[PDB]
Amino acid sequence: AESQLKRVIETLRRLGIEEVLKLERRDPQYRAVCNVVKRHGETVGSRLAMLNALISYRLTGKGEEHWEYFGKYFSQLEVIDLCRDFLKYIETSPFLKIGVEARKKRALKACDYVPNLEDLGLTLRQLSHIVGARREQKTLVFTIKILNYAYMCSRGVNRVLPFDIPIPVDYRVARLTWCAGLIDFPPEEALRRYEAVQKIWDAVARETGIPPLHLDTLLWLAGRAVLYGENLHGVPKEVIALFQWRGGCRPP
Template sequence: MVVTIREERVRRVADAVRSLGLEAILRLEELLDPQYAALQGLADAVGRGAAAAYAVLVAAVSYRLAMRGEEWWSCASQLLSGYPPPRDVESLRANVERFLAECRGSIIAREAKVSRVRRLAAGARDLLSRLLSDADLPLREPGRVLEGVARALGSEREAKTVAFSVKMAYYAARPRGSMRPLSFDLPMPVDVRVACVSVTSGIVEVKASYRELVREPRPAQQAWAQVSRLSGVPTPHLDSLLWVVGWAPRDLPQAEARAAIERRLREASIPPEAARSVATELTYVPCR
């Protein structure tokens, strides 16, 4: 796969994101990201620590889903909220296995997902136990969560579900109204939405399909890390922005996608000029 990072486009996208600002993106997460809403509902039911531990395990098996991501997290929140609250890692693992058996979103490769949960629960036992008793751990030491999950799964830090586990644990742990961001050193999880926007924003140029970036995410992760550094917005929060608006360049023609992104950002009370700038820079070229 031949991928080129385009420095000029990185700077233009970073300028647009900087005009938006980190506080606006944190507000956007609360108002528009259904994953945050689902995990806050779970935290209300079982406590922030247990919700963060659940989030680590569920995020690690959030692949090859038979439903949209927002539906998956809603299913997780509803089912896990109804089970007896986990007392320890064993009951935590058992509840997640029960969720996998009952949620239709896990029907593809369900046995592999169960095996992965068991592997993570065994290999990251100390981390999960700590999360159950220390809900602020993902806020205070996200790198510790990242390393613990990667080591337990034998995966690289850049692996999509590894980085995603940290982001979802943070969502569960961060109370509503908190303006406490994550640190800068988390790799961007590159799913099809992020891969598409990586191309449509022009920050990377791919000779083949944008889907190649899902299989080999490092060029996109490097480009978004540069956007993060230049804009002052940590990559997990860039990921939130792309999650909320990233469906549009993939599903709509370029001009319609630009208008849809601008409207969506205005729903979070983003000023019109900043919303227009972000929408324009994220739809620089069509998705292909």
């Protein structure tokens, strides 16, 4: 795990933060969010993207497919009242059919909230209170990453996220951490012990110069290839190889 930790650091050190930012523009999720922002403008588009991130849990299929549906839905539809229209979308989407009333309830709490795209740290604190969760919880930090996508699209700029916002420990991140040999307890346990997993990726961030929410992009892109055998050039070959250390960590 210490030896694996060193291998991971010295491999990702090969990629600058500049290369990571470039790689990140090819995330299918970035394209969906950017299509919605181009259609609706910065304020409305960023609100829609925010709401989508806040309910991106217990999906039927892949994260990426859910985001593609979101992009197509809002890119070709006029939006008048944001709460109403978003709740209607929740009732329609095949990715969101599980626990729809609890989803609507969460969306209703954050409905009227306008995020501050220039101070994402302030926004994370505000979201923690509105939604009612610890700031390190996976859906909160993932929402910050989505907000960065919306800002970068809107303004046509790069922006490197802070080191002090940790990685979102979903089931994909937990499995990949296990697959790279960085943890000895199972991925299902890692979801509960998310702070311990966050501590590992913080170490990696400090030593590589790649902040945790940008590391998240590398794991998600790599996961597409290791778990499903798809988008095989999403990251360099040597990055993929890091997450194939344990037996089972290959496509069927």
